[PDB]
Coordinates of C-alpha atoms in Angstrom, one line a residue:
Chain A
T1 CA 119.9 224.3 143.9
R2 CA 123.7 224.6 144.5
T3 CA 124.9 227.5 147.2
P4 CA 127.6 229.1 144.1
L5 CA 131.1 229.7 146.4
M6 CA 133.6 231.8 144.6
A7 CA 137.3 231.1 145.4
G8 CA 139.5 233.8 144.9
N9 CA 143.1 231.9 144.8
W10 CA 146.2 234.7 145.5
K11 CA 148.7 232.0 145.6
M12 CA 152.4 233.6 146.3
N13 CA 150.7 236.5 147.1
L14 CA 150.4 239.5 149.8
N15 CA 152.8 239.5 152.6
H16 CA 150.3 239.3 156.2
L17 CA 149.7 243.4 156.0
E18 CA 148.8 243.1 152.5
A19 CA 146.7 239.9 153.7
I20 CA 145.4 241.9 155.6
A21 CA 143.8 245.3 153.6
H22 CA 142.7 243.6 150.4
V23 CA 140.6 241.7 152.7
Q24 CA 139.4 244.8 154.7
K25 CA 138.9 246.5 150.7
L26 CA 136.2 242.8 149.9
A27 CA 135.0 243.8 153.6
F28 CA 134.2 247.0 153.2
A29 CA 132.9 246.5 149.0
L30 CA 130.6 244.0 149.5
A31 CA 127.2 244.2 151.2
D32 CA 124.8 242.0 152.9
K33 CA 123.0 240.4 149.3
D34 CA 126.5 239.3 148.3
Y35 CA 126.6 236.5 151.3
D36 CA 123.2 235.9 150.7
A37 CA 123.4 234.8 148.0
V38 CA 127.1 233.5 146.4
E39 CA 129.4 231.8 149.0
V40 CA 133.4 233.9 149.1
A41 CA 136.3 232.3 150.1
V42 CA 140.2 233.6 149.9
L43 CA 143.0 230.8 149.2
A44 CA 145.9 233.0 151.4
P45 CA 148.9 232.2 151.6
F46 CA 150.0 230.0 154.7
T47 CA 151.8 233.3 156.2
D48 CA 148.9 235.0 155.9
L49 CA 146.3 233.0 157.8
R50 CA 146.6 233.8 161.2
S51 CA 146.2 237.3 160.4
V52 CA 142.9 236.5 158.3
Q53 CA 141.4 234.8 160.7
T54 CA 141.7 237.4 163.2
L55 CA 140.1 240.0 161.0
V56 CA 137.4 237.8 160.1
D57 CA 137.6 237.2 164.2
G58 CA 138.1 240.9 165.0
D59 CA 135.3 242.2 162.2
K60 CA 132.8 239.2 162.0
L61 CA 133.5 239.3 158.6
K62 CA 131.4 236.6 156.0
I63 CA 134.0 236.1 154.1
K64 CA 135.7 231.7 154.2
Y65 CA 139.3 231.5 154.3
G66 CA 140.9 228.5 152.9
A67 CA 145.0 227.2 152.5
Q68 CA 146.3 226.8 149.0
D69 CA 147.7 222.9 149.9
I70 CA 148.1 220.2 153.0
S71 CA 150.7 217.7 153.8
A72 CA 148.9 214.9 154.2
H73 CA 149.9 213.5 157.3
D74 CA 148.6 214.7 160.3
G75 CA 152.3 216.1 162.2
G76 CA 156.0 214.0 162.1
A77 CA 158.9 214.9 160.6
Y78 CA 158.3 216.1 157.2
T79 CA 159.7 219.6 157.2
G80 CA 158.7 222.6 156.0
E81 CA 154.6 221.2 155.5
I82 CA 151.8 221.8 157.1
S83 CA 149.4 219.2 158.6
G84 CA 144.9 219.2 159.0
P85 CA 145.3 220.3 162.7
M86 CA 147.5 223.7 162.2
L87 CA 145.1 224.8 159.2
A88 CA 142.3 224.1 161.3
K89 CA 143.3 226.0 164.3
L90 CA 143.8 228.3 162.4
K91 CA 139.8 228.0 161.7
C92 CA 140.3 227.7 157.7
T93 CA 137.4 225.8 155.8
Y94 CA 138.4 225.3 152.6
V95 CA 141.8 224.1 150.7
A96 CA 143.4 223.9 147.5
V97 CA 144.2 220.6 146.9
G98 CA 146.3 219.3 143.1
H99 CA 146.0 222.1 141.9
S100 CA 148.0 222.5 138.8
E101 CA 150.9 224.5 139.6
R102 CA 151.9 221.9 142.6
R103 CA 150.8 218.8 139.8
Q104 CA 153.7 220.1 137.8
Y105 CA 156.2 221.6 139.7
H106 CA 155.6 219.1 142.4
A107 CA 155.7 216.6 140.9
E108 CA 151.3 216.1 142.6
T109 CA 150.1 212.8 142.5
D110 CA 146.4 211.8 142.2
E111 CA 147.8 208.9 145.1
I112 CA 149.9 212.2 146.8
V113 CA 146.4 214.7 146.1
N114 CA 143.7 211.5 147.1
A115 CA 146.3 211.6 149.9
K116 CA 145.3 215.3 150.9
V117 CA 141.7 215.4 149.9
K118 CA 141.4 212.2 152.7
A119 CA 144.1 214.4 155.1
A120 CA 141.5 217.5 154.9
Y121 CA 138.2 215.8 155.8
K122 CA 140.0 214.0 159.3
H123 CA 140.2 218.2 159.9
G124 CA 137.5 219.2 159.5
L125 CA 138.8 221.0 156.4
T126 CA 137.1 220.8 152.4
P127 CA 139.5 220.3 149.9
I128 CA 138.6 222.2 146.5
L129 CA 139.4 218.8 144.4
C130 CA 141.9 220.7 141.3
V131 CA 141.4 218.0 138.1
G132 CA 141.8 219.2 134.8
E133 CA 143.8 217.6 131.4
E134 CA 146.5 219.3 129.5
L135 CA 146.5 219.7 125.6
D136 CA 147.7 216.8 124.3
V137 CA 144.6 215.0 126.0
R138 CA 143.0 217.9 125.1
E139 CA 144.0 216.8 121.5
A140 CA 143.3 213.3 121.7
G141 CA 139.4 213.9 122.5
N142 CA 140.1 212.2 125.9
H143 CA 139.5 215.5 128.4
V144 CA 136.6 214.4 129.7
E145 CA 138.2 210.8 130.0
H146 CA 141.0 211.9 132.1
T147 CA 138.9 214.3 134.2
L148 CA 136.4 212.0 135.3
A149 CA 140.1 209.4 136.3
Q150 CA 141.1 212.2 137.7
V151 CA 138.6 212.6 140.3
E152 CA 137.9 209.5 140.7
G153 CA 141.7 209.2 141.2
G154 CA 141.2 212.1 144.1
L155 CA 138.2 210.7 146.1
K156 CA 139.9 207.6 146.8
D157 CA 138.3 205.9 149.1
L158 CA 136.6 209.0 150.8
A159 CA 132.7 208.3 152.2
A160 CA 129.7 209.0 151.1
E161 CA 129.4 211.2 154.1
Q162 CA 132.4 213.1 153.6
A163 CA 132.8 213.1 149.7
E164 CA 129.0 215.2 149.8
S165 CA 130.6 218.5 150.8
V166 CA 133.3 218.1 148.0
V167 CA 134.3 220.6 145.9
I168 CA 135.7 219.8 142.5
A169 CA 137.9 222.6 140.5
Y170 CA 137.8 222.2 136.8
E171 CA 141.6 223.3 135.5
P172 CA 141.8 223.5 131.9
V173 CA 145.5 223.0 131.7
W174 CA 145.1 223.4 128.1
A175 CA 143.3 227.2 128.2
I176 CA 144.9 229.2 131.4
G177 CA 148.0 230.6 130.1
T178 CA 146.7 229.4 127.2
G179 CA 145.2 232.1 123.9
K180 CA 143.5 229.2 123.6
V181 CA 139.8 229.7 125.8
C182 CA 138.0 227.4 126.9
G183 CA 133.9 228.1 126.5
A184 CA 131.6 227.8 129.3
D185 CA 129.9 224.6 126.5
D186 CA 133.5 223.1 126.4
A187 CA 133.6 223.1 130.4
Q188 CA 129.9 222.3 131.2
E189 CA 130.8 219.3 128.8
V190 CA 133.8 218.2 131.3
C191 CA 131.6 219.4 134.1
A192 CA 128.8 217.7 133.8
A193 CA 130.5 214.6 132.9
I194 CA 132.6 215.1 136.7
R195 CA 129.4 215.5 138.1
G196 CA 127.9 212.0 135.9
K197 CA 131.4 210.3 137.0
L198 CA 130.8 211.3 141.2
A199 CA 127.0 209.8 140.2
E200 CA 128.5 206.4 139.2
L201 CA 130.9 206.9 142.2
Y202 CA 128.5 207.5 145.1
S203 CA 124.3 208.9 144.4
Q204 CA 122.4 211.2 142.1
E205 CA 121.8 212.3 145.4
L206 CA 124.3 212.6 146.4
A207 CA 126.4 214.8 142.8
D208 CA 123.3 217.2 143.4
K209 CA 124.9 218.4 146.3
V210 CA 128.3 219.0 145.1
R211 CA 129.6 222.8 144.1
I212 CA 132.1 221.8 140.8
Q213 CA 133.8 225.2 139.4
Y214 CA 135.5 226.3 136.7
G215 CA 138.9 227.0 137.4
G216 CA 140.4 228.2 134.1
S217 CA 140.4 232.3 133.3
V218 CA 137.5 233.7 134.7
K219 CA 137.3 237.8 134.3
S220 CA 134.4 240.0 134.6
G221 CA 133.4 239.8 130.6
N222 CA 134.2 236.0 130.9
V223 CA 132.2 235.2 134.2
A224 CA 128.7 235.8 133.2
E225 CA 128.2 232.9 130.3
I226 CA 130.5 230.2 132.5
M227 CA 128.7 230.6 135.4
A228 CA 124.9 230.2 133.6
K229 CA 125.5 226.1 132.8
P230 CA 123.4 224.6 135.3
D231 CA 126.2 221.9 136.7
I232 CA 129.7 224.9 136.9
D233 CA 128.7 226.2 140.7
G234 CA 131.0 229.0 141.3
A235 CA 135.3 229.7 140.3
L236 CA 138.3 229.4 141.6
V237 CA 139.6 232.6 140.4
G238 CA 143.3 233.0 139.5
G239 CA 145.4 236.3 139.1
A240 CA 141.4 238.5 139.4
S241 CA 141.9 237.1 142.7
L242 CA 144.4 240.0 143.7
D243 CA 142.0 242.9 142.4
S244 CA 139.5 243.8 144.5
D245 CA 137.1 245.2 142.5
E246 CA 136.8 243.1 140.3
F247 CA 137.1 239.6 142.6
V248 CA 134.1 242.3 143.8
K249 CA 132.4 241.9 140.5
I250 CA 132.9 238.2 139.5
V251 CA 130.6 237.5 143.5
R252 CA 128.7 239.7 142.0
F253 CA 128.7 237.4 138.4
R254 CA 125.2 239.1 137.8
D255 CA 126.1 241.2 136.2
Chain B
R1 CA 181.9 231.2 165.9
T2 CA 178.8 232.1 168.4
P3 CA 177.0 229.1 168.0
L4 CA 173.7 228.5 166.9
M5 CA 171.0 226.3 167.8
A6 CA 168.3 226.1 165.8
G7 CA 165.2 224.0 167.1
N8 CA 163.4 222.9 163.6
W9 CA 159.8 222.3 165.1
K10 CA 159.0 220.1 161.5
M11 CA 155.5 219.8 160.9
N12 CA 154.2 220.5 165.1
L13 CA 152.7 223.9 167.5
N14 CA 149.3 225.2 166.0
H15 CA 149.2 229.2 166.2
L16 CA 148.3 228.9 169.8
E17 CA 151.5 226.3 170.8
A18 CA 153.7 228.5 169.2
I19 CA 153.5 231.1 171.3
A20 CA 152.7 229.1 175.2
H21 CA 156.9 227.5 173.4
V22 CA 158.7 230.1 173.0
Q23 CA 156.1 231.8 176.6
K24 CA 157.8 228.4 177.6
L25 CA 161.3 229.1 176.5
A26 CA 162.6 232.3 177.5
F27 CA 161.4 231.5 181.2
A28 CA 163.5 228.8 181.4
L29 CA 166.9 231.1 179.4
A30 CA 168.6 233.5 181.4
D31 CA 170.9 236.7 179.8
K32 CA 174.1 234.1 179.8
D33 CA 171.9 231.2 178.2
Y34 CA 172.1 234.2 175.1
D35 CA 175.6 235.8 175.2
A36 CA 176.6 233.0 174.4
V37 CA 174.9 230.7 171.9
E38 CA 172.8 231.8 170.0
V39 CA 168.7 230.1 170.1
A40 CA 166.9 230.5 167.2
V41 CA 163.6 228.0 166.2
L42 CA 162.6 227.0 162.3
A43 CA 159.0 226.9 163.0
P44 CA 156.1 226.3 160.6
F45 CA 154.5 229.3 158.5
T46 CA 151.3 229.3 160.0
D47 CA 153.2 230.0 163.0
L48 CA 155.3 232.7 162.1
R49 CA 153.4 236.0 162.8
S50 CA 151.9 234.2 166.3
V51 CA 156.0 234.4 166.9
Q52 CA 156.7 237.0 165.2
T53 CA 154.5 239.6 167.3
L54 CA 155.3 237.9 170.9
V55 CA 159.0 238.9 170.1
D56 CA 158.0 241.6 168.9
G57 CA 156.2 242.9 172.0
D58 CA 158.2 240.9 174.4
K59 CA 161.1 242.3 172.9
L60 CA 162.7 238.5 172.6
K61 CA 166.3 237.9 172.4
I62 CA 165.9 234.3 170.7
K63 CA 165.3 234.4 167.0
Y64 CA 162.7 232.7 163.8
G65 CA 162.8 230.8 160.3
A66 CA 161.4 228.8 158.3
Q67 CA 161.8 225.9 157.2
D68 CA 161.2 225.6 154.1
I69 CA 162.0 229.1 150.9
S70 CA 159.9 229.1 147.9
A71 CA 163.2 229.8 145.0
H72 CA 160.3 232.3 143.2
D73 CA 160.0 236.2 144.2
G74 CA 156.3 236.2 143.8
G75 CA 153.6 234.0 141.3
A76 CA 151.5 232.0 139.9
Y77 CA 153.5 229.9 142.4
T78 CA 150.5 228.1 144.2
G79 CA 151.5 226.8 148.2
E80 CA 154.2 228.5 148.6
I81 CA 155.9 231.0 150.4
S82 CA 158.5 233.3 149.3
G83 CA 160.8 235.6 150.8
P84 CA 159.2 238.7 150.1
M85 CA 156.6 237.2 153.0
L86 CA 158.9 235.7 155.4
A87 CA 160.9 238.9 155.1
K88 CA 157.6 241.0 156.5
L89 CA 157.3 238.3 159.0
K90 CA 161.2 239.4 160.3
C91 CA 162.0 235.8 159.9
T92 CA 165.9 235.4 160.7
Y93 CA 166.6 232.1 158.7
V94 CA 165.2 229.6 157.2
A95 CA 166.1 225.9 156.5
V96 CA 166.5 225.1 152.4
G97 CA 167.3 221.0 151.0
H98 CA 166.4 219.7 154.1
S99 CA 166.5 215.8 153.5
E100 CA 163.0 215.4 153.9
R101 CA 162.2 217.9 151.0
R102 CA 164.8 216.6 149.3
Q103 CA 163.3 212.9 149.5
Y104 CA 159.6 214.0 150.1
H105 CA 159.5 216.7 147.7
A106 CA 162.2 216.3 144.7
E107 CA 164.7 219.1 145.9
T108 CA 167.9 218.8 143.8
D109 CA 171.0 220.6 144.1
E110 CA 169.6 222.5 141.8
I111 CA 166.4 224.3 143.3
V112 CA 168.0 224.2 146.6
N113 CA 170.6 226.2 144.7
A114 CA 168.3 228.8 143.9
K115 CA 166.4 228.3 147.2
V116 CA 169.7 229.6 148.5
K117 CA 169.4 232.6 145.9
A118 CA 166.5 233.6 146.9
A119 CA 166.9 233.8 150.8
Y120 CA 169.1 236.0 150.4
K121 CA 167.6 238.3 147.4
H122 CA 165.7 239.8 150.0
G123 CA 167.2 239.7 153.8
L124 CA 168.0 235.8 154.8
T125 CA 170.2 233.4 156.0
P126 CA 169.5 230.7 154.9
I127 CA 170.1 227.0 156.8
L128 CA 171.5 224.0 153.9
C129 CA 170.7 221.5 154.7
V130 CA 173.2 218.5 153.4
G131 CA 174.4 214.8 153.7
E132 CA 174.1 210.7 152.3
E133 CA 171.8 208.6 152.6
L134 CA 172.7 204.3 153.3
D135 CA 174.5 203.6 149.9
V136 CA 176.8 206.8 150.2
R137 CA 178.1 205.5 153.7
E138 CA 178.3 202.3 153.1
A139 CA 179.5 203.0 149.7
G140 CA 182.5 205.1 152.3
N141 CA 181.6 208.1 149.5
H142 CA 179.5 209.7 152.4
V143 CA 181.9 212.8 151.9
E144 CA 181.9 213.4 148.6
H145 CA 178.6 213.0 147.9
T146 CA 178.1 215.8 151.3
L147 CA 180.6 217.9 149.8
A148 CA 178.8 218.1 146.4
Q149 CA 176.1 218.8 148.0
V150 CA 177.2 221.7 149.5
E151 CA 178.9 222.8 146.5
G152 CA 176.3 222.4 144.4
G153 CA 173.9 224.5 146.7
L154 CA 175.9 227.2 147.1
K155 CA 176.9 227.8 142.8
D156 CA 177.0 231.1 142.3
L157 CA 176.8 232.9 145.6
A158 CA 179.6 235.4 145.7
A159 CA 181.3 235.9 149.3
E160 CA 180.1 239.3 150.3
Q161 CA 176.3 236.4 151.0
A162 CA 178.0 232.9 151.8
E163 CA 180.5 234.6 153.6
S164 CA 177.4 234.5 156.7
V165 CA 175.3 231.0 155.7
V166 CA 175.1 228.0 158.2
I167 CA 175.5 225.0 156.5
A168 CA 173.4 221.8 158.7
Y169 CA 175.3 218.2 157.8
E170 CA 172.1 215.4 158.3
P171 CA 173.7 212.0 158.8
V172 CA 170.6 209.6 156.5
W173 CA 172.3 207.0 156.7
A174 CA 171.4 206.6 160.7
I175 CA 167.9 207.7 160.3
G176 CA 165.9 204.2 161.1
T177 CA 169.0 202.3 160.7
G178 CA 169.5 201.3 163.7
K179 CA 173.3 202.8 162.6
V180 CA 174.2 205.6 165.4
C181 CA 176.8 208.4 163.9
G182 CA 179.4 209.5 166.8
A183 CA 180.7 213.2 167.0
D184 CA 183.6 211.5 166.0
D185 CA 181.5 210.3 162.4
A186 CA 180.3 214.0 162.0
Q187 CA 183.8 216.4 163.5
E188 CA 184.9 214.7 160.8
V189 CA 182.0 215.7 157.5
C190 CA 181.7 219.4 159.1
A191 CA 186.2 219.2 158.7
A192 CA 185.0 218.5 155.5
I193 CA 183.0 221.6 154.3
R194 CA 184.4 224.1 156.0
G195 CA 187.9 222.9 154.0
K196 CA 185.1 222.7 151.0
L197 CA 184.0 226.5 151.7
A198 CA 187.7 227.5 151.9
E199 CA 188.0 226.3 148.5
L200 CA 185.4 227.8 146.4
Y201 CA 186.8 231.1 148.6
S202 CA 189.2 231.4 151.3
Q203 CA 190.3 230.4 155.0
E204 CA 189.2 233.0 156.1
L205 CA 185.2 233.2 154.0
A206 CA 185.8 229.0 155.7
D207 CA 186.7 230.5 158.9
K208 CA 183.3 232.7 159.7
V209 CA 180.5 229.7 158.5
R210 CA 178.8 228.0 161.4
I211 CA 178.3 223.7 160.8
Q212 CA 176.0 222.8 162.9
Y213 CA 175.1 218.3 163.3
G214 CA 171.5 218.0 161.4
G215 CA 171.6 214.5 163.2
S216 CA 169.3 212.9 166.2
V217 CA 170.2 215.5 169.1
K218 CA 170.3 215.2 173.1
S219 CA 170.4 216.8 175.7
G220 CA 173.2 213.8 176.6
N221 CA 174.8 213.6 173.6
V222 CA 174.9 217.6 172.8
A223 CA 178.3 218.5 174.9
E224 CA 180.1 216.1 173.3
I225 CA 179.4 217.1 169.3
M226 CA 179.6 220.6 170.8
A227 CA 182.8 220.1 171.3
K228 CA 184.0 219.1 168.4
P229 CA 186.3 222.1 167.1
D230 CA 184.6 222.8 163.9
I231 CA 180.8 222.1 165.1
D232 CA 179.0 224.5 165.2
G233 CA 176.4 224.2 166.4
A234 CA 172.4 222.2 165.9
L235 CA 169.1 221.4 163.7
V236 CA 168.0 220.3 166.4
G237 CA 164.8 218.2 165.6
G238 CA 161.8 216.1 168.3
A239 CA 163.8 217.9 171.0
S240 CA 163.7 221.1 170.1
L241 CA 159.8 220.1 170.9
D242 CA 160.7 219.9 173.9
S243 CA 160.9 223.3 176.3
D244 CA 163.3 221.9 178.3
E245 CA 165.8 219.8 176.6
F246 CA 166.1 222.1 174.2
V247 CA 167.2 224.5 176.8
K248 CA 169.9 223.0 178.3
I249 CA 171.3 222.2 174.5
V250 CA 171.6 225.7 174.1
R251 CA 173.3 224.6 178.3
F252 CA 176.0 222.4 176.3
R253 CA 179.1 223.5 178.3
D254 CA 176.7 221.3 181.5

């Protein structure tokens, strides 16, 4: 079965010194039994990736790191953008792509995200395809249908030999910064459908290898029921990824 | 006004190539170069720590900066980079509202104005990029549009901040059109720009603000451009990636 992946998304937090400290903290608190059973990753601000790489290389940490975004292009006249080759030279493993914040604040489209998905693979990175429906879609009872299309759009023209290693993170945008909670049954339902949609686009042999993360509000209280689910293989953690003790707990969803 | 040559790498150079660049750069430059001209490189986020350690290590006179900044000070803004982050890396500058981000990332005068304030909030110096595309130039309204871009960008910025701001004019009508922007064309705008700054603040202030040319700048054209009375530097594109041609530009007098 699938090795679960716990990715801490720092968002726009931590300077390069704080990044160094926080990752040290994590390495202090985690033990061999932790890395043996669960995959641990931190997605750090661009400006922090060099500091995290030298530390990760320096103290030989088992913690993975990745970016929070990537340019669809390989290089060139794209002011402010960070390319696949740049993230690769810093030896990032992952890159969150299509995070709900970027679909909203920066008008990222399925077409744009798909391109970023492809740029990631072209460049030896593993994309974390962030998908999810807002409130209106959930009220319409079409949530899976929308999420299932988003996964397909994001995965457009992607060969199975790449897709086999992809990560999908489901963000129930209707229920994260929201008093409405998305229970594990609700997320299991989408994450099941997602694996079901992947089966159609590819093969059940592939679909069972793809880690599907939960991207709602994940805390120590939540993490157990969510994880028990048969088609949830990890979590893309928000605010709690910034708290050393709470991230370490999540990595041990085995409360 | 100390002229400012800011090398905009755009989406180029990994962290070790970046270091090699700046090493190449410092190797080719002498004290008389920095004495007359301010030298800066605007590098990808991921290169900034590497450049800082090199510049802090070898006590270089070359400055470095970012190609973007988030309007926010921190928070749930995935993928964006904040002032405090750029501030810790000891950046000097940050480009804001570059035509590429205005085109590809729907950055508005309103979004651009917010980055300018954020830049100042955290002890960075913004380089506010302004300019018109083809239609505004053919309509003969380029100056009108560019100037609206400058006023919008600088809204609610007090004189003690704006007096250190840098403006870069990008002739967007002359990238990929086959049309050339002469030094004659650019001087006119940078002139208008300084005139607008004078209204919004004072002539005394307006005379302290460096206004760059952000069009195509080569070793061949750099002298003619700089000899214009209201151009105080260049926001260099592709040639900024070329150590030799960038060193010539910094030495535009030759």
